């Protein structure tokens, strides 16, 4: 999976968050902004065959499932040190 | 008995009959679809309303659900039954193995030891690592903090400390994963089981996928296990995978708890929430805890409130710099910012103390010259100023070291360096014995003898 | 030999001033990216204070 | 009878509910028993029905919801005139020197409107201070307003003590000293200084020290103005000294949030320019009498951008800026010539002789500040020999503006110097021309006249 411009997801959680009056943190993102991306990304994983067997209800056996992820972020002026990066 | 009356993100309000209102920090229980959800009580509002944080996902909660009042706090298994096992914040088993053979459960909310109970100790603990025990050595029973930004090396450093300390140490250990990567929890567990050292280690994991209530209280689950082993009279090692996540999970809930924002939007309670956690991690006349904590530094801003508050809590502080790491000098320790309570002539003795202050003085003077060099170039320097630079650059390389856990990145084999070899090497460089070698001779060599053998082949 | 070394001094200074001019031009742009971060951050802080103080 | 009741106490701010037909006017005083002690409140706002929001002129500690409040149908009134002289009073005009009752014949409200446009005067008679950098760079006039700007620890107090010594003893007329937000130690040392030098009978002091509740510091400056306005309206010429104008604005900031106002700017009260203007516009010299005033101005972190110092600059006539950048070198008085200025520095008052000398000194120090940037990186050899000469004679003039004060001997250990304006002009001309090109820089530092800078060179 490729996610293009997770920077633009972040900018649109700030809009929803600020329209709901939630206190902004660093820059203007909410404190929840780390939970936004980490809950998203932590789902990309390789799972052992015992998990695949349990999920499939034994229909698939001995195969390890996987999901690679390539998130894209955009830096202003090449600044790697900003909050969302 | 109770009714849910609001659900706002992680926060759930519950109404009770006014004769029956739960105490603060009581556990509640509610059926959420096909699973059981625990809630922890944070505040008593008026009128029998009580405000609580969900220890799990709050989606699918309706208003009007019946809530059950447990008469006690969150209580977790403790003792040897926890050794070799992976546990939830709630102290549930998270490995596929059976139930935990508990004999006792302890509440995770506890008071710190009294001022009379505390104990001093000056036993220097050796590490494999040239920069750390030269510049910021630390004692058995002390606290160490690794400060750094994103991707600078906090975890690789803590994995060498686990390798060096926690396998020449003989007692039990606790590793608390707090808001970090689930992959790295699985990777660590397998190398413990493959090495058959797992049976000495307790692992509590509340990684970054977990909802805020898990990330906040998993730190306290981790300490409560370590406090059982300490009060039993043991010497214990506690590793905390990222202390910053404890504070951040407080920030996430604090607005929903109805608290006005402070400073850079932190919770107003930031220093108390950190302080009550930190004061429990202390060695005592009954037994000892040695602690290593990683401390994420948001946006590399060491003046942000959360790093700043953490600095007063700790006995040795090692600061990792992105600017050094991008040189590829590893460990990326900044020796002008790293410091320890133990760098004192009485405990270290004079030869170590003089070598550390010499290195600090030369490297400071090199910072003072770099703004000259940046515009004019080096040729404008004085011939002594050129010698300070020519030494300082060697010193910066010799601070580098191959780690045994880093072989999967560097390939070249890891080195363990004695304190006698480290002070001898830097003292020799500053005396100028080695001013005929090139800078590359010093990069990534274990000991000063290894530098001269590298220099023969340049 | 004195005259020919003097010609070499002026040549070496001409080149050294090229480096000093490019080095100075390289520093100014890094000081400006650093300033625009501070310029933006302080605006963003003080509006968080003004809105928070309108409780 | 007492007719209102306290209905909230939050910090320094107390709300009182009166009957709907007898509500106190704005700025009326109110009175309540805080146990044994009588406490005064000043009405700030009328809000809702019958309720008034007030600032306590004393500690809120021990107030209860429910206490009966008396309505005094006048604002805070203070004793004025000759009875005040040689006395120390608080904001309420009560004696705090133990000497007994003030014994007044008249009392005036501290709140009053400024002089009307028709009453003002422009009598810019030049006034000599005996301080080289002030008399050259920022000449005073009688009846003007002078501000001493600077951050912490730069010399505002000892400059004001020097100005008090030189003019205020010579003045032959009454003086008022307002200790707004001052340190209690320094207010004591000033009182003994005036007593031991035996001039205290000319001067009346109003003191509102820091420890005092925010209400007191908010109003103590108006008590000082009201005494000075009584002597002006008599037709006397008076000197008014203010310990720190900034601390009045800061006391306004403290209460402003509790008074329910939304914040502005760098967290200042929204009314900042109105509150400054309403105080400053009373300190003026009318056709009947003149008030000459010297005000110290705290500059937070030496940032002259900050709204409180930036706003006051418009109300003054001479402004002296004391800089930590100079003070770091120890070269007191630490007056910056390139930022200090006065309305009186033009040829139609100063004459061309003085005007040309001051503009000359400014041009040289301006040029040298650009040259100093070259030197620090490239070195001094890269200059023209004429720019080297300007760097020399500028760096001398920078030291020659220094002068030891005989209120600073305790710091220096050395004898203080006074200079005439005539001798000051001649000295700067002499450095601007060749006469002293051959003296070292250290031969100027904390000297006195030019006529003795040669002597320190011979000693150096
Ligand atoms: N001693 C070392 N030798 C080689 N590489 C290293 C060393 N220390 C760190 N690095 C490199 O830095 C990268 C990240 O380090 P590490 O994973 O320890 O950071 P981290 O603590 O996880 O940072 P964060 O927790 O913010 O992600 C890894 O690629 C690692 O190879
Ligand atoms: N003219 C001066 N001569 C000698 N020392 C001075 C002079 N001006 C200031 N200082 C030093 O600076 C200190 C603080 O200055 P002061 O005026 O007392 O503080 P502030 O400027 O904050 O009122 C003095 O105690 C003294 O040490
Ligand atoms: Mg890490
Ligand atoms: Mg002062």
Coordinates of N, CA and C in Angstrom, one line a residue, chain A residues 24-25 27-28 77 79, chain C residues 33 37 44-45 48 51:
Chain A
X24 N -5.2 23.1 20.3 CA -4.1 22.8 19.4 C -2.8 22.7 20.2
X25 N -1.9 21.9 19.7 CA -0.6 21.7 20.3 C 0.6 22.4 19.6
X27 N 2.8 23.6 16.5 CA 2.2 24.2 15.3 C 0.8 24.4 15.6
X28 N -0.1 23.8 14.8 CA -1.5 23.8 15.3 C -2.2 22.5 15.3
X77 N 11.2 23.3 2.7 CA 12.6 23.7 2.6 C 13.6 22.5 3.0
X79 N 13.4 20.7 5.5 CA 13.5 20.6 6.9 C 12.9 19.3 7.4
Chain C
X33 N 16.5 30.2 6.7 CA 15.5 29.1 6.9 C 15.2 29.0 8.4
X37 N 11.4 29.8 10.5 CA 10.8 28.9 11.5 C 10.4 29.6 12.7
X44 N 2.3 31.6 15.8 CA 1.4 30.5 16.1 C 1.2 30.3 17.6
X45 N 2.3 30.6 18.4 CA 2.1 30.6 19.9 C 1.2 31.6 20.4
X48 N -2.5 31.1 20.1 CA -2.9 30.1 21.0 C -3.1 30.6 22.4
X51 N -6.4 33.2 22.2 CA -7.7 32.4 22.1 C -7.9 31.6 23.4

